[PDB]
Amino acid sequence: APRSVDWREKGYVTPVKNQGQCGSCWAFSATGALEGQMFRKTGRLISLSEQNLVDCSGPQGNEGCNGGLMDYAFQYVQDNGGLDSEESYPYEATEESCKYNPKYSVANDTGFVDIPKQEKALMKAVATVGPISVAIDAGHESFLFYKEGIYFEPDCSSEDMDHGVLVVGYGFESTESDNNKYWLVKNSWGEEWGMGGYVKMAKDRRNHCGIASAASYPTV
Ligand SMILES: *[C@@](O)(C(=O)NCc1ccccc1)[C@@H](C[C@@H]1CCCNC1=O)NC(=O)[C@H](Cc1ccc(F)cc1)NC(=O)c1cc2ccccc2o1
């Protein structure tokens, strides 16, 4: 496995988005993973619709702006046999009735793979598959104020994640050893948060914040 991976510089990652005041972290996390896999499959990088996921994934168990799972979004894409593009079904940060139009479908998947809960497998999956959809514990106030460096909430939980985010790679900082490894994580709170909307999560520090607890990716 390589020592550093960054899927942004290879063209797998859409620009950073802003979810607003609606609990659709899962939707954005699912669309990023599916964008990565669609690009790997065809070489075409198309922003997908979070609103479609929010509005139409009800039957699969999701709760719109009131919570959602990324596996449930992949299941909705598979059952629905399609996912509209961001441009056709633009984000409105609210719950609305499903307006899916198969004419504007630009993505689909045949299921999803759940990663074993250990950071080594997460590293392997990120290296070989691409951006991976994950969950982390971000309820602590420190996460709200992140700016740069490796983020390390001493009170983070490894088994109770509440935020879905995407992992676009991993790397290390050139310091004198002292466990410098980090996960490159993309967030959905815009660009003015963290490093242009990104965060370096602590890597190989005993599954800090349960990043490797709920890792999965859609199979196209
Ligand atoms: C999410 O991190 C977020 O969007 N935060 C910003 C925000 C804006 C407005 C209001 C609140 C937060 C957050 C969103 C939920 C729902 C909205 C209300 N409060 C929240 O905390 N997290 C999730 O939505 C979460 C993501 C997740 C996925 C996978 C995993 F292993 C852990 C977490 N999913 C749920 O909370 C959830 C999912 C389901 C599915 C079925 C029934 C109930 C569910 O609850």
Author numbering: 1 to 220
From the article:
Cathepsin L (CTSL) and calpain-1 (CAPN1) are host cysteine proteases which play crucial roles in coronaviral entrance into cells and infection-related immune response. Here, for the first time, two peptidomimetic α-ketoamide compounds, 14a and 14b, were developed as potent dual inhibitors targeting both host CTSL and CAPN1 with IC50 values at low nanomolar level based on structure-based drug design. Meanwhile, 14a and 14b also showed weak inhibitory activity against SARS-CoV-2 Mpro with IC50 values at micromolar levels.
A fluorescence resonance energy transfer (FRET)-based cleavage assay was used to evaluate their enzymatic inhibitory activity against human CTSL, and the results showed that 14a and 14b exhibited potent inhibitory activity against human CTSL with IC50 values of 3.34 nM and 6.88 nM, respectively. To elucidate the mechanism underlying the potent inhibition of human CTSL by 14a and 14b, the crystal structures of human CTSL in complex with these two compounds were solved at 2.4 Å and 2.9 Å resolution, respectively. The thiol group of catalytic C25 attacks the electrophilic α-keto group of the α-ketoamide warhead, resulting in the formation of a thiohemiketal. Apart from covalent interaction, four hydrogen bonds can be identified in the complex structure. At S1 subsite, the hydroxyl group of this thiohemiketal forms one hydrogen bond with the Nδ atom of H163. As expected, the deep hydrophobic S2 subsite, which is formed by the side chains of L69, M70, A135, and M161 and the main chains of M161, D162, H163, and G164, was occupied by the 4-fluorophenyl group at P2 through extensive hydrophobic interactions.
